[PDB]
């Protein structure tokens with residue numbers, strides 16, 4: 001092949017600080033963290049994955065393979081891996097963006113978010129996944145909360161808990177955001193990621209409304225077998241919304257492939273106003289509220 | 305062009321039940337039913353279509369594309385669908401045309417169909433098909449069996465399982481293979497699998513002769529294979545007895561070999577709307593002097 005001239009930074013546990021916990025699991029747990037590196041004035045937002053136990057050689061094998069893949073990931077729309085840290089409990093530092101996640105952004109800015117932006121993010125999210133899918137990497141948790149805002153023009157999808165097919169499947173919870181075949185079998189393919197990519201665009205178009213809200217997670221299995229999907233967002237034409245219906249096809253192969261979505265979504269992004277209808281579309285970028293919590297330096301800016 | 309703000313509603317199959325099979329088909333089965341929107345306290349009678357097997361991705365893509373057209377058309381003479389059900393095998397929920405195909409309607413009632421309705425029914429098909437010509441669409445299976453009767457006064461068009469859309473660039477569409485009823489199709493479609501609206505004027509043509517004879521079998525004894533031969537040779541369908549030569553000439557100008565020689569639907573609307581201003585004059589039928597909610601829920 002080619003040399004994987006990928007770089008692996010070793011940070012010291014006294015450089016990063018765990019602020020609060022994000023997710024948790026049997027083995028492993030994910031925190032919100034601030035990185036203060038090598039005596040600079042800058043503080044960079046990050047998320048840190050910690051093996052819950054420090055002596056488990058099968059678990060320690062796993063957490064390094066993931067470090068391996070996250071460090072091999074070099075794409076503008078998948079988060080970089082800032083560095084690992086060899087405590088007893090091995091830690092991974094993925095970067096975060098200073099402005100926060102899309103969902104919190106889209107919710108806070110829906111009276112000045114435009115049509116060219118919404119369609120421009122669908123290509124960035126789809127570009128990022130087809131990068132991942134290009135690598136036999138399944139993502140298993142795509143959602144607006146896991147798409148971070150670098151600049152209202154650039155978004156990356158966080159890549160913790162990726163699943164390489166080292167083949168037609170790999171097993172492994174976010175019920176609203178999952179394919180039926182995931183709820184009933186806890187199996188994740190790339191086409192189940194397409195389902196997630198579906199629900200992700202829905203959260204975007206609705207300006208951050210909650211998928212299947214109030215409804216219990218035990219029903220979603222059933223109210224999917226029976227054919228209820230998310231409704232049409234108001235601003236969606238029937239061209240946009242057919243993409244979303246196709247992502248939630250019960251048949252997995254009937255679902256759009258990721259290479260297709262970007263073709264389809266940039267074509268619709270060259271005439272943006274023809275596919276999305278937003279009141280006042282014609283007549284602004286700024287800071288967020290996740291960003292207000294921190295007061296604040298992008299990690300892509302420091303390491304340059 | 306214009307943003308297509310046509311929405312499609314998604315319905316879970318708990319919101320409708322099927323009461324009666326209206327017909328088995330190669331498409332599959334279509335049922336008669338009541339659809340009670342959850343939330344709403346109306347029942348709306350509906351017709352529910354359900355293909356044989358959702359095994360192929362091609363089968364799914366051709367049912368969701370059939371649903372894309374039906375959902376975005378707002379024409380009075382184009383049967384519209386209410387919503388879709390994304391079950392394992394998807395499901396289509398359309399307004400129930402209570403009276404059947406026109407093909408069924410005019411055999412049962414050959415004894416009580418005056419000239420006014422038959423020419424009114426031809427102005428209505430032509431208006432729906434000129435809506436479809438305006439949306440760059442080719443229906444590709446028009447026939448009295450695919451024209452449904454919501455009321456004797458008002459007829460609508462249906463079954464876009466074979467409908468195909470044109471780009472702005474190409475003026476004609478060409479499929480391969482397929483299974484299409486040979487007796488309703490223009491000669492170029494039989495012979496080159498070419499299609500275009502001018503091939504659908506020919507279909508419209510056969511649809512009238514269907515109506516004008518009160519629902520006969522076109523080329524009845526003739527099997528499908530010979531029709532290419534017989535058309536090339538200049539055989540066409542005979543004159544309906546009810547028909548004047550003014551009216552039967554129009555069906556002739558449809559089965560014209562040259563597709564642009566054939567008449568545009570825009571013309572067909574005017575030519576038949578005049579004819580319905582003096583209907584006794586262009587059609588001759590002995591006796592002719594003598595003879596829950598709905599799509600009211602849409603607005």
Ligand SMILES: COc1cc(N2CCC(N3CCN(C)CC3)CC2)ccc1Nc1ncc(Cl)c(Nc2ccccc2P(C)(C)=O)n1
Pocket residue numbers: 326327328329331334336351383398399400401402403404405408449450452462463
């Ligand atoms: C209840 O109203 C109907 C009655 C019948 N009848 C007509 C007489 C027929 N006869 C009666 C006498 N009997 C002894 C032998 C049979 C039985 C079926 C058929 C159809 C509708 N309405 C209806 N609405 C919407 C649709 Cl969308 C649809 N579609 C549809 C219905 C049936 C078959 C195919 C279709 P398609 C072309 C694929 O939509 N169909």
